[PDB]
């Protein structure tokens, strides 16, 4: 599909949706509606920021407060979100 | 300031504001409210996405449609935005 950033911003984690399932849906939107490959090392911070911003609000607020946030990989962020999601 | 992604999302080009002045404010928000340095080359596609998304909608829609958008530098996007802004 032709580039449409709104489609990427429109991927929001559902109330029952696991962080890893949400991340896969977010990556699919990057693939379909941007020229950026969400698996590229150069895109990690970009996907990470969308992941944090568009996670369910309780999760997003906690991910944003992680210590040494800059050091967190996309995999780290998913694991931290899962801790909040699973309790 | 402590990380606060809403402040980055809240930087939007003003109705009469030049693209270059808007990008300066967007970079300032990245510096103040994220751990991501907007002058780090590793962050350029991240700042570029925010710039397209948060530009005035007429400009952002045109930037989305640039041929070979993936190869545009942040400096390229600003120049093309300035070309649109100045008629
Ligand atoms: Co496509």
Residue numbers in the entry:
A (entry chain A), B (entry chain B): 1 to 87
Sentences from the paper on this structure:
Immature retroviruses are built by the Gag polyprotein; Gag is then cut into domains, and the resulting CA capsid proteins form the mature capsid, which can mediate infection of a new cell. Murine leukemia virus (MLV), the prototypic member of the γ-retroviruses, is commonly used in comparative studies and as a basis for retroviral vector design. The CA domain and immediate downstream residues mediate protein interactions in the immature shell, and, following proteolytic cleavage, CA forms the mature viral capsid. In this study, we have determined the structure of the truncated MLV CA-CTD by X-ray crystallography and have resolved the architecture and CA lattice structures of immature and mature MLV particles by cryo-ET and subtomogram averaging.
